[PDB]
Amino acid sequence: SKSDQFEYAWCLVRSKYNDDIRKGIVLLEELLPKGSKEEQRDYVFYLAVGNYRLKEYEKALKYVRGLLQTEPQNNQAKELERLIDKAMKKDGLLEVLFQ
Amino acid sequence: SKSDQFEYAWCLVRSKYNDDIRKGIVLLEELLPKGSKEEQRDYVFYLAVGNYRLKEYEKALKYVRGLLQTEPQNNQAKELERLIDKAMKKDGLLEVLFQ
């Protein structure tokens, strides 16, 4: 069933282990076409969370951004974009810490 | 399907969140009668891991023990009983640390 693959992928994207988090993601990507209007809004937000936890900060942003133009005022999406920028600003400091 | 409820409960019992771990457990308890000989050996071992992660050290032992009389030489079960005793010895030190 469709409501059940989500749960599995939700529990997966929550795991402490990166491998479970890739699997949680790929299941969401397959689940994305099969989605309803607001089912997709939810999958997209959870792909961003997963990608963000894998330091795939680029890809994460591309999701949370695409959701944000659909839903400009989702302050849960706003806050998830606010945490992705900070990760990224701190990362690019540590990147050039040796010039 | 039966092979699939396991995965869900396996990913659940692996989670960082206690609530996911209770749900992972209860699914295993329902799954226990439906089991094969060695499917049950596996469920029991994973109920012990889950209970152990919830500091339910009593209940954990009762599983890893019941498996151990079936499988005296499962050194993965032996090692899981070895980690449950240490937890428990350290716990009962901190218990009476004030007399």
Numbering used by the authors:
A (entry chain A), B (entry chain A): 31 to 129
What do the paper's sentences say?
A tetratricopeptide repeat (TPR) motif containing mitochondrial outer membrane protein, mitochondrial fission protein 1 (Fis1), mediates mitochondrial fission by recruiting large cytosolic GTPase, Drp1, to the mitochondrial outer membrane. The cytosolic domain of Fis1 is composed of 6 tight α-helices with two anti-parallel TPR motifs forming a concave hydrophobic surface. Fis1 interaction with Drp1 occurs during cellular stress, but not under physiological conditions, suggesting that cellular signals during stress activate Fis1. Human Fis1 protein contains a single cysteine, Cys41, in the entire protein.
